[PDB]
Design a protein around this ligand. Structure first.
Ligand SMILES: *[C]C(*)(*)(*)(*)([C]*)C(*)(*)(*)(C(*)(*)(*)(=O(*)*)N(*)(*)(*)C(*)(*)(*)(*)([C](*)[C@]1(*)=C(*)(*)(*)C(*)=[C@](*)(*)C(*)(*)(*)(*)(*)(*)=C1(*)(*)*)C(*)(*)(O*)C(*)(*)(*)C(*)(*)(*)([C](*)C1(*)(*)(*)=C(*)(*)(*)(*)(*)(*)C(*)=C(*)[C@@](*)(*)=C1*)C1(*)(*)(*)=N(*)(*)(*)C(*)=C(*)(*)(C(*)(*)(*)(=O(*)*)C(*)(*)(*)(*)([C])[C]*)[N@]1(*)*)N(*)(*)(*)(*)C(*)(*)(O[C]C1=[C][C]=[C][C]=[C]1)=O*
Lengths: 99, 99
């Protein structure tokens, strides 16, 4: 799909048996989702953005269905205001930026 | 151009007689540039990112060359880690995400 940007690029994701809308974020190296029940081990990892650093739950080889497109990756879980789909998943769904 | 996301979407911009590399960002509503040598009146404005909140100075009516494509708008200057190009300027240069 061709998504224009007059509105925040929000898409629907299905993760861990649940539904959440997420922002397609070309400015995020990583995918970070707001706190949710997700299964198995993880690792502490801190990530940085505007405003500062937050501590996150590092999850890998997690299946996410992005706008009904499946993929598997590192998903970080934590104190983020918006669910963010970062470039580590954007290239999986073959998403490009165009102008 | 058409940018695939396997690496950060950095692009060259020219603002206020100077040259910088900035990141095209679909998750940024606004454009926030590092502390720079930019002139006019500006108003305090504050923003939220994943780590929290910075105070920035807002300049409106600013001209920017993003890939030889000049656009005009609001530019927020302050303590950002990288130069960010938000959706307020991205829509102006015809930017769309595709997948
Ligand atoms: C993975 C994520 C933590 C990412 C990040 O925060 N990215 C920012 C832009 C950025 C900031 C600092 C450095 C580099 C890029 C942005 O994409 C995130 C959004 C998240 C968001 C979206 C919607 C609502 C609320 C939050 C964002 N932050 C601020 C906005 C705004 O719209 C403001 C203008 C109101 N939107 N970090 C990352 O790597 C960090 C890094 C690593 C190595 C060197 C330098 C930086 O990609």
């Amino acid at each position: 799909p061709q998504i224009t940007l007059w509105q925040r690029p929000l898409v629907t994701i299905k993760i861990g048996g649940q539904l959440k809308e997420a922002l397609l974020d070309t400015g995020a190296d990583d995918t970070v989702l707001e706190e949710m029940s997700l299964p198995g081990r993880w690792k502490p990892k801190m990530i940085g953005g505007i405003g500062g650093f937050i501590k996150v739950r590092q999850y890998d080889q997690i299946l996410i269905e992005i706008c009904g497109h499946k993929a598997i990756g590192t998903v970080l879980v934590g104190p983020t205001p918006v669910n963010i789909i970062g470039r580590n998943l954007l290239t999986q769904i073959g998403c490009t930026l165009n102008f």
